[PDB]
Design an enzyme around this catalytic site. Structure first.
Site, mmCIF file in Angstrom:
data_model
loop_
_atom_site.group_PDB
_atom_site.id
_atom_site.type_symbol
_atom_site.label_atom_id
_atom_site.label_comp_id
_atom_site.label_asym_id
_atom_site.label_seq_id
_atom_site.Cartn_x
_atom_site.Cartn_y
_atom_site.Cartn_z
ATOM 1 N N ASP A 111 45.466 31.636 42.971
ATOM 2 C CA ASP A 111 45.557 31.234 41.603
ATOM 3 C C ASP A 111 46.249 31.988 40.785
ATOM 4 O OD1 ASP A 111 45.017 29.273 39.453
ATOM 5 O OD2 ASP A 111 43.286 30.047 38.774
ATOM 6 N N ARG A 158 47.851 33.269 33.059
ATOM 7 C CA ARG A 158 46.338 33.338 32.599
ATOM 8 C C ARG A 158 45.440 34.190 33.211
ATOM 9 N NH1 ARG A 158 47.431 28.532 35.081
ATOM 10 N NH2 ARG A 158 46.099 28.268 36.913
ATOM 11 N N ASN A 159 45.938 34.600 34.495
ATOM 12 C CA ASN A 159 45.003 35.373 35.387
ATOM 13 C C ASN A 159 45.593 36.860 35.324
ATOM 14 O OD1 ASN A 159 42.701 34.066 36.226
ATOM 15 N ND2 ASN A 159 43.828 32.807 37.849
ATOM 16 N N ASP A 218 41.194 37.655 38.422
ATOM 17 C CA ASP A 218 40.847 36.333 38.767
ATOM 18 C C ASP A 218 39.726 35.867 38.068
ATOM 19 O OD1 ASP A 218 40.364 34.140 41.664
ATOM 20 O OD2 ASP A 218 40.535 33.421 39.824
HETATM 21 C C1 LIG Z 1 34.175 40.273 34.548
HETATM 22 C C2 LIG Z 1 35.017 40.163 35.645
HETATM 23 C C3 LIG Z 1 34.676 39.749 36.926
HETATM 24 C C4 LIG Z 1 35.639 39.548 37.948
HETATM 25 C C5 LIG Z 1 37.136 39.596 37.585
HETATM 26 C C6 LIG Z 1 37.997 39.563 38.612
HETATM 27 O O1 LIG Z 1 39.206 39.604 38.277
HETATM 28 N N1 LIG Z 1 37.700 39.302 39.747
HETATM 29 C C7 LIG Z 1 38.503 39.089 40.862
HETATM 30 C C8 LIG Z 1 38.117 38.381 41.928
HETATM 31 C C9 LIG Z 1 38.829 38.268 43.053
HETATM 32 C C10 LIG Z 1 40.073 38.884 43.078
HETATM 33 C C11 LIG Z 1 40.453 39.459 42.171
HETATM 34 C C12 LIG Z 1 41.840 40.188 42.207
HETATM 35 F F1 LIG Z 1 42.349 40.294 43.408
HETATM 36 F F2 LIG Z 1 41.787 41.462 41.674
HETATM 37 F F3 LIG Z 1 42.551 39.327 41.620
HETATM 38 C C13 LIG Z 1 39.593 39.698 41.068
HETATM 39 C C14 LIG Z 1 37.343 39.928 36.303
HETATM 40 C C15 LIG Z 1 36.269 40.140 35.044
HETATM 41 N N2 LIG Z 1 36.649 40.468 34.025
HETATM 42 C C16 LIG Z 1 37.084 39.776 32.927
HETATM 43 N N3 LIG Z 1 36.495 38.622 33.241
HETATM 44 C C17 LIG Z 1 36.763 37.461 32.077
HETATM 45 C C18 LIG Z 1 36.509 36.153 32.266
HETATM 46 C C19 LIG Z 1 36.641 35.291 31.038
HETATM 47 C C20 LIG Z 1 36.418 33.924 31.177
HETATM 48 N N4 LIG Z 1 35.821 33.625 32.332
HETATM 49 C C21 LIG Z 1 35.407 34.386 33.407
HETATM 50 C C22 LIG Z 1 35.658 35.734 33.423
HETATM 51 N N5 LIG Z 1 37.613 37.819 31.030
HETATM 52 C C23 LIG Z 1 37.835 39.164 30.853
HETATM 53 C C24 LIG Z 1 38.516 39.731 29.739
HETATM 54 C C25 LIG Z 1 38.992 38.784 28.888
HETATM 55 C C26 LIG Z 1 39.656 39.151 27.634
HETATM 56 N N6 LIG Z 1 39.746 40.688 27.437
HETATM 57 C C27 LIG Z 1 39.577 41.416 28.301
HETATM 58 C C28 LIG Z 1 38.891 40.962 29.627
HETATM 59 N N7 LIG Z 1 37.668 40.095 31.816
#
Ligand SMILES: Cc1ccc(C(=O)Nc2cccc(C(F)(F)F)c2)cc1Nc1nc(-c2ccncc2)nc(-c2ccncc2)n1
Length: 275
Positions: free
Chosen positions: A136, A140-141, A154
């Protein structure tokens, strides 16, 4: 052992302040972490979660703990010993890259734009080498910090317009279908967050792709950059660049910046005639 690359954080070190989204079975919050207070994003797993949800939750935390790269979101830690369970990451004040560019139309140099793309590619090259298929990849990610550094993330909300044909047609998701998505990300960046294919429906996008049409050049876009995103969109998966190839090309363009001054012709939709 799933959490081996992770730090367990005590619940007394975390304070949640505002809901910023929804997770699989819990809310995502904006909060502070004590280790002097650091802002963080927090994804929770509330009471009642299934066994499958718990496997996926702690599995996400485990793979995140294993990634250590400048252009990948960094895991601060995890709460697994107490309820509700939590995934805690760094917080980026500039937020998501697609919204960021749309609110800052025209404000950066082409060198800055291409630099953001080189960072995203270095992160994807790292993911692919670690044998992690994103599935994905889209603006946006991706998160932007206050040095303009892009971090692949993600948020799990899932994307026909970003997805390679073999992934759409028969669910073949690979690092080569992520390269197709990366081409779309290059187009998002150079257009300051325009919507891919504009008002075309999902079915119109797929028919256009299958008939051989591809997105046109952004305005003010270096020829080399448009050539590169075009080769990401080859129908034949085996013909696309690998991420190693993309990183290398982008790095050489940046390090010989005159290379970016030759611009692809832009196809005007409107004619304006003046004397
Ligand atoms: C809390 C959290 C948990 C998991 C992840 C995440 O990227 N996980 C992930 C999972 C699989 C693969 C990867 C990879 F490979 F790094 F891309 C990352 C990110 C976050 N951080 C996050 N999530 C969100 C979020 C928003 C809405 N719905 C779900 C998560 N938003 C924000 C955010 C928004 C605005 N300004 C700063 C940070 N940060």
């Amino acid at each position: 052992a799933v959490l081996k690359f992770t730090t367990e954080i005590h619940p007394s070190c975390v304070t949640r302040q505002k809901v910023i989204g929804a997770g699989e079975f819990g809310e995502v919050y904006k909060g502070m972490l004590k280790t002097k207070e650091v802002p963080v994003a927090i994804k929770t797993l509330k009471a009642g979660y299934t066994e499958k949800q718990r496997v996926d939750f702690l599995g996400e935390a485990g793979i995140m703990g294993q990634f250590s790269h400048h252009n990948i979101i960094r895991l601060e830690g995890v709460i697994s010993k107490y309820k509700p369970m939590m995934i805690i990451t760094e917080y980026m004040e500039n937020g998501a890259l697609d919204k960021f560019l749309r609110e800052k139309d025209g404000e950066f140099s082409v060198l800055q734009l291409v630099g953001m793309l080189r960072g995203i590619a270095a992160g994807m090259k790292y993911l692919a080498n670690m044998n992690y298929v994103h599935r994905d990849l889209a603006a946006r990610n991706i998160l932007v910090n206050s040095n303009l550094v892009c971090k692949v993330s993600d948020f799990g909300l899932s994307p026909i317009r970003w997805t390679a044909p073999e992934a759409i047609s028969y669910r073949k998701f690979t690092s080569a279908s992520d390269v197709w998505s990366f081409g779309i990300v290059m187009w998002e960046v150079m257009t300051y967050g325009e919507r891919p294919y504009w008002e075309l429906s999902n079915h119109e996008v797929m028919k256009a792709i299958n008939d051989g049409f591809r997105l046109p050049t952004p305005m003010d876009c270096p020829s080399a950059i448009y050539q590169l995103m075009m080769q990401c969109w080859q129908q034949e998966r085996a013909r696309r660049p690998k991420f190693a190839d993309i990183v290398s090309i982008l790095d050489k363009l940046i390090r010989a910046p005159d290379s970016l001054k030759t611009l692809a012709d832009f196809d005007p939709r409107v004619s304006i005639r003046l004397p």
